Design an enzyme around this catalytic site. Structure first.
Site, PDB file in Angstrom:
ATOM      1  N   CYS A 144       2.740   0.490  -8.475  1.00  0.00           N
ATOM      2  CA  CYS A 144       1.750   1.533  -8.766  1.00  0.00           C
ATOM      3  C   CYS A 144       1.913   2.212 -10.136  1.00  0.00           C
ATOM      4  CB  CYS A 144       1.728   2.577  -7.639  1.00  0.00           C
ATOM      5  SG  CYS A 144       1.312   1.887  -6.013  1.00  0.00           S
ATOM      6  N   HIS A 185      -7.948   3.667  -6.825  1.00  0.00           N
ATOM      7  CA  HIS A 185      -6.608   3.420  -7.357  1.00  0.00           C
ATOM      8  C   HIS A 185      -6.467   1.956  -7.707  1.00  0.00           C
ATOM      9  CE1 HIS A 185      -2.347   3.046  -7.776  1.00  0.00           C
ATOM     10  NE2 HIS A 185      -1.996   2.994  -6.482  1.00  0.00           N
ATOM     11  N   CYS A 221       3.892   7.817  -7.573  1.00  0.00           N
ATOM     12  CA  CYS A 221       4.821   7.263  -6.594  1.00  0.00           C
ATOM     13  C   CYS A 221       4.722   5.743  -6.645  1.00  0.00           C
ATOM     14  CB  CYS A 221       4.540   7.796  -5.182  1.00  0.00           C
ATOM     15  SG  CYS A 221       2.873   7.503  -4.544  1.00  0.00           S
ATOM     16  N   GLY A 276       6.035   1.739  -4.876  1.00  0.00           N
ATOM     17  CA  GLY A 276       6.652   0.856  -3.884  1.00  0.00           C
ATOM     18  C   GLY A 276       8.099   0.533  -4.218  1.00  0.00           C
TER      19      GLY A 276
END
Lengths: 729, 401, 398
Positions: B92, B357, B387, B389
């Site tokens: 991300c 996103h 944030c 993964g």
């Protein structure tokens, strides 16, 4: 490259060679050293020679039949050798299974049809040989079983079992249905899931049918004869390979699903099987096969496989061979069983006795009560009927074997009594007194008792020689152990008769000497007592439950406590206190006793009264009682999870050692299987006695490591964790 | 640590929706080339030979997104052959990582002018399309307790005590603020309409937006259904043993949208911009990479923000605008709670719940969003974080120049 | 402000394409093995001070998908704060990882960084990840996509390198790799690959053919590059009538499996952990040249990095260029007039193999060792790249 163990400068031959006029070779497996063909050093050399000869004489060979000369086809590998394998032996274990598979790979890529004629049980190594064949015919005979059960020994199918079943069924189906649990299949079921191709009615039909199949295959399919599906150009794995989008989408959930099923218990075999399966699926057959060998060697040289081989091979063998059955005693067949009490225990006992084929008279204080007891069997039969596991005809005969009564006189002709009434000595005296003259003079007088000494119960009958503890576990239809308890007056003949009864109903016996709490009840007590102590210390209930499941117990300890009933736990503690205080000594209460008494005071004494550590509604367990956290200041104590786990496991292991020292148990085999089957001690440990000698922690392995960790827990949590003198040097 | 790094341009495509989306017919490469051509239009006389690298974030670099899409963009747009092209993946955070990396290359002194950003066509190349070293490996997956993002998000809400109404209240707020930003003309110059080979309009707005969202509408939605596939709840609670039950509060309405999009950012030294006659918009003050537990997965932003604040010698009070990607409502509420961020400073123009996103591009999109809002408010400092993964976190401080 | 130092540089042996020892080994396991070796070298290293893990990988799909760098961080039990990013700049990915790590260290915003690469080509063949330059017609048609072996043959044609010229270089690479091995040059840096039981899988570079002869090389057939690509190349290079196809499997890089890892940090970060610096990253540069010929990027990148460091060819003790194809090396040598005894002195990819994403990090480590062994001062490391890119790095021995 060689089919042999050695290639430098002397085992028996186990394979009979026969070549027909048509060029069909029959390999009949017949190990002279036993009644079973086992994947041992003798087999490896024999099959090596046989396979060499198949290649050497290939111009005159048209097909092969793999047969057996025993009652069974082929069952198991060399466990005796595998249990001895140290980490430094990893190379040799690797080489052994690599050699085994090289032989089967040659057999499989001969350019000719190979047919397995499966006359009886083909289990583990036995089925792996059969899977290397291009066609499998099984004799649909009684007692015949097919499967790959090596996960139950903490191993994996290392002779091609993983690689081939995955190639046949795909990752998910091979794992779930065959590998993960080591499921055994009847021939009909084996055919259904594709583990077997054809069935015949008798064993004599096998070889001729195999030869006929070879004949037809050569005529009808000359180009594809002796070619497994995975060795063909356009082969597609069922369900896809890991790179195919369909499977790729569900694959990452396979390990989490497995972890869910195992509840986080440290049992390495299932994860090793899953890894071998998936990794194998990513590559060509030979590479897949070699990866399989490496995961096998990893399990073999590990501690858990040693625990499991010890319990589920050696200990079980010893028990089933009459290790605790007194020697020079004959047989006495049972004609009519009488059960006293129609609660869960009595109803369950009636079911398993009737399912075994025995006539059962089920007596309670009213006909209504006894009938509802039989209703227990009716509900089990109805559920088995819907699942298709039995016929209407077979079920009706089972239920008709159970006669519910309220009349004592209906125990006429009863030669085997099993009492399962309320835990009270004077009640048991009274209930036996009402019946001891009505039954046959030679009748066993058996008591299902959790704690009360059998010697004390025996005084209530005239023939104390025939009085004995016959201890079942709830639910009786599922729990495989019977704890047989020898009273001071109990005769050796009485022990044997109950021993034989246990085997007849398909359960596993242990023989225990009289002592209150016996083995199972006393030891399970220490497990739940640790959990309750932790709750009293201020440990989160949710953590305690997690610790129980991650230790490997089938049910978490606070849940179990509700089922055991806290009022029973209380009077067990009251009884122990009385013994000490009457002898002039000072009683040292377990810290759990205050937690038990607190819950009683709060009107939360367990499931039976409607409330315990859990909430209960509509006959179902709801969740943890929200008032639990405030009552015991939960969160105030936060020890490591591994400490919580170890406190439970260690308490039981130490208590088992006390039982062995006191002469309650007479063998580690009985201790191990008894703990596993009776009180749900985790299978990966190999049992409560094996846990001591096979302990593995951050600070080493073995008895010395167990002692060190026990001393570690003792300093932190109390002197009860100090090891007995028997464990020290 | 020598040369200062400046943002000179920051642009993005609108975000196309996952289902019957306007950008579904558009190759991810075309999305990048479109943005390159917009920068060319804005600065016709720029010497492209001075561009030494093009760094693109991309989470699923496979198919249309394989084969170093950054180099593909360099060559397809007819940029000079010396202009590099590298693809990177830090899940991300990829888009912001590309910008941070670009800034760090400028700071080292060995690059002068760099294009950074990201691209993700999730409707054409869905999340997980690239396989995954962890997932294709049961032995790895088993040991490092792999748990999908939404469960960690639910777990955050369970522990912190964020109710279904709490997370939906944040979702409504995101829709409101995105709509206000769009109505106000805040995105007029930075959102570049996607057009075809013939100049015809394909998309000019963030079509995932639902500006008429209500409290009741959000309450009617079902929890997320990698989800529905069992195991992960039990696995999560095996690590978090003190938690009894995971409260499943996250839905399609309070989680980020799956969308298509790209973003580009021009980063260079003061001299590089001066030589090309470029006006600096912001300075990259500091960057930080940190992390947290990979099972809860999404608590990485807190340590990364703390580390970037300490490195820049600043505190929460010194920052005017906080921008944290809205992957899940609880992640934002947790971040806000941990650091006592004032509501009026947090994701002020809406976020991924409203607008979507597009994994690889998002970091660069929300960075650009902050460059523009700092200028519009005439404010000084913004902190941008996401944030990630695996439990990672990335954060960046920018100062308006 | 900060200088970037190399503290450790290690690699796996390279496993061959056909019946290779590493085919059964997951690329993740290759990286984790190297992380475990670094841990063994420095058991007291505070891993919390490692701020990132940067891995080159050219085919990041399947086994190599899902940010394999992060996977390695987690699978190895490294701290959750230690990052993990995958990058792809084709053949240069391994060196790009090292360069990026150095640039982050110099920026002052990362303290200590692990960098390297992984490529298991036998499990994840090149082209496995797809791509637009190859697979999308509209843009393939416009960039004039031509496979690298044709550019290599085209270089040989233009420069006048004959079949014997390229084969002679190939023989030399085999000889120098054999000599480096037998001389023990690689004993410390090549980390044997072992299974979960400690059993040996591979301890040497399998692709090597130490008994190569000029006569055997002459027997090989020229080298997918089948269907139309010759005519496309000659459309751009219109003055050359016919491409002389000189490259074979014997004078081109081997397709192999392998991984490499490099520990990079500031002086302070190394001092704090008691690590001894082995070399300093002097300068980095990325550049490019015609994407059709594809493989001439090393020259302008080397030119740029030399000028950036204020150095000339004469200041450099060792030159290390990836041996993708023999002509590429000979072309590079010709342009910059590199003395023979300074070039790829321990053999290269022709002998040992080219595991795409790892190679840049492997040959960098090769130079760190060789400078130390010779007690020499400077090495220049460079690689040609798909799409016509070029990367170069100068290291100085400390």
């Amino acid at each position: 490259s060689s089919h042999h163990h050695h290639h430098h400068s002397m085992p028996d031959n186990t394979i009979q060679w026969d070549k027909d006029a048509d060029g069909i070779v029959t390999l009949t497996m017949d190990d002279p050293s036993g009644s079973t063909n086992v994947m041992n050093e003798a087999y490896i050399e024999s099959m090596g020679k046989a396979v060499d000869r198949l290649v050497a004489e290939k111009d005159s060979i048209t097909g092969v039949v793999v047969a057996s000369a025993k009652k069974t086809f082929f069952a198991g590998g060399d466990v005796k050798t595998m249990i001895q394998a140290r980490p430094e032996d990893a190379g040799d274990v690797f080489n052994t299974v690599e050699t085994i598979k090289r032989q089967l790979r040659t057999l499989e890529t001969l350019g000719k049809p190979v047919v397995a004629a499966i006359n009886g049980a083909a289990l583990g190594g036995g089925l792996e040989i059969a899977l290397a064949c291009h066609h499998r015919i099984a004799a649909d005979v009684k007692g015949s079983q097919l499967g790959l059960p090596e996960v139950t020994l903490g191993l994996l199918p290392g002779g091609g079992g993983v690689t081939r079943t995955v190639r046949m069924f795909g990752i998910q189906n091979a794992f779930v249905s065959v590998l993960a649990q080591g499921t055994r299949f009847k021939p009909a079921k084996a055919k259904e899931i594709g583990l077997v191709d054809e069935l015949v009615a008798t064993v004599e039909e096998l070889v001729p049918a195999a030869k006929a199949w070879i004949k037809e295959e050569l005529k009808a399919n000359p180009d594809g004869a002796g070619v497994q599906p995975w060795d063909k150009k356009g082969y597609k794995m069922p369900g896809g390979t890991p790179s195919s989008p369909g499977l790729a989408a569900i694959l990452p959930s396979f390990p989490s699903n497995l972890r869910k099923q195992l509840k986080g218990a440290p049992m390495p075999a299932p994860r090793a099987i899953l890894a071998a399966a998936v990794e194998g699926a990513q590559v060509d057959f030979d590479t897949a096969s070699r990866i399989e060998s490496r995961y096998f060697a990893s399990l073999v040289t590990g501690q858990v496989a040693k625990n499991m081989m010890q319990a589920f091979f050696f200990d079980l063998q010893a028990i089933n061979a009459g290790g605790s059955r007194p020697e020079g005693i004959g047989k006495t067949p049972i004609k009519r069983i009488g059960v006293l009490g129609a609660g869960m225990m009595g109803a369950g006992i009636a079911y398993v006795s009737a399912k075994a084929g025995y006539e059962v008279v089920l007596k309670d204080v009213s006909l209504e009560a006894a009938a509802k007891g039989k209703g227990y069997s009716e509900k089990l039969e109805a559920k088995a009927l819907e699942r298709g596991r039995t016929t209407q005809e077979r079920s009706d005969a089972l239920l008709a074997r159970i006669t519910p009564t309220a009349d004592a006189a209906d125990f006429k002709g009863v030669d085997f009594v099993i009492e399962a009434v309320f835990e009270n000595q004077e009640l048991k005296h009274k209930v036996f007194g009402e019946i001891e003259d009505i039954v046959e003079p030679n009748a066993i007088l058996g008591s299902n008792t959790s704690t009360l000494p059998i010697t004390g119960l025996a005084t209530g009958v005239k023939r104390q020689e025939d009085f004995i503890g016959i201890h079942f576990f709830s639910p009786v239809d599922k729990m495989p152990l019977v704890e047989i308890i020898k009273g001071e007056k109990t005769s050796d003949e009485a022990l044997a008769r109950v021993f034989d009864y246990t085997l007849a109903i398909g359960k596993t016996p242990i023989v225990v000497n009289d002592s209150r709490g016996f083995f199972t009840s006393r030891v399970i007590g220490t497990f739940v007592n640790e959990a309750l102590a932790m709750l009293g210390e201020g440990v989160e209930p949710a953590s305690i439950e997690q610790a129980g499941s991650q230790a490997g117990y089938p049910a978490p300890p606070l849940q179990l406590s509700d089922e055991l009933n806290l009022e029973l736990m209380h009077k067990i503690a009251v009884a122990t206190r009385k013994g000490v205080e009457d002898a002039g000594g000072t009683y040292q209460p377990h810290p759990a006793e205050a937690v038990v008494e607190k819950m009683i005071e709060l009107g939360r004494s367990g499931r039976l009264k409607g409330a315990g550590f859990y909430e209960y509604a509509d006959g179902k367990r709801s969740g943890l009682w929200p008032g639990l956290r405030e009552t015991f200041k939960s969160g105030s104590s936060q020890p490591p999870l591994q400490d919580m786990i170890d406190r439970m496991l260690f308490a039981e292991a130490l208590e088992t050692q006390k039982c062995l020292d006191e002469g309650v148990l007479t063998s580690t085999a009985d201790a191990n299987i008894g703990s596993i089957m009776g009180i749900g001690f985790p299978p990966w440990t190999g049992g409560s006695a094996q846990f001591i000698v096979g302990y593995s922690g951050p600070a080493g392995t073995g008895k010395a490591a167990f002692v060190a960790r026990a001393r570690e827990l003792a300093a932190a949590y109390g002197d009860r964790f100090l090891p007995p003198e028997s464990l020290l040097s | 640590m020598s040369e200062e790094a400046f943002i000179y341009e920051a642009i993005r495509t609108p975000r196309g929706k996952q289902k019957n989306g306007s950008l579904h017919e558009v190759k991810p490469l075309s999305l990048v080339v479109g943005l390159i051509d917009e920068l060319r239009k804005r600065h016709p006389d720029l010497d492209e030979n001075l561009i030494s690298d093009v760094i693109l974030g991309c989470v699923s670099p496979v198919g249309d997104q394989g084969g170093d899409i950054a180099r593909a963009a360099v060559l397809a747009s007819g940029m000079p052959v010396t202009s590099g092209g590298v693809q990177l993946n830090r899940f991300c955070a990829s888009g912001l990582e590309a910008v941070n990396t670009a800034a760090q290359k400028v700071r080292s002194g060995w690059d002068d002018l760099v294009l950074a950003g990201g691209v993700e066509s999730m409707s054409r190349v869905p999340m997980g399309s690239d396989g995954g070293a962890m997932g294709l490996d049961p032995a790895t997956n088993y040991d490092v307790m792999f748990v999908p993002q939404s469960i960690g998000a639910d777990l955050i809400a369970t522990i912190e005590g964020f109710s279904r109404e709490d997370v939906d209240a944040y979702a409504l707020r995101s829709q409101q603020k995105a709509a206000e930003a769009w109505s106000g003309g805040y995105f007029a110059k930075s959102v570049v309409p996607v057009r075809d080979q013939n100049g015809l309009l394909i998309l000019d707005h963030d079509e995932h937006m639902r500006p008429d969202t209500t409290k009741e509408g959000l309450a009617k939605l079902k929890p997320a259904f990698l989800a529905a596939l069992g195991g992960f709840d039990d696995v999560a609670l095996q690590k978090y043993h003190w938690v009894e039950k995971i409260n499943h509060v996250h839905t399609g309405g309070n989680s980020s949208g799956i969308v298509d999009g790209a973003a580009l950012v021009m980063i260079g030294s003061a001299a590089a911009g001066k030589l090309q006659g470029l006006t600096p918009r912001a300075r990259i003050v500091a960057t930080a990479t940190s992390g947290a537990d990979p099972v809860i997965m999404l608590t990485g932003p807190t340590p990364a923000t703390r580390k970037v604040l300490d490195r820049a010698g600043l505190t929460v009070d010194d920052i005017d605008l906080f921008e944290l990607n809205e992957a899940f409502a609880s992640v934002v509420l947790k971040f806000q709670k941990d650091l006592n961020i004032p509501d009026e400073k947090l994701n002020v123009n809406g976020g991924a719940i409203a607008m979507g996103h597009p994994l690889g591009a998002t970091g660069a999109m929300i960075l650009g969003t902050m460059v523009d809002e700092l200028e519009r408010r005439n404010a000084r400092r913004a902190l941008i974080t996401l944030c990630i993964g695996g439990g990672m976190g990335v954060a960046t401080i920018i100062e308006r120049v």
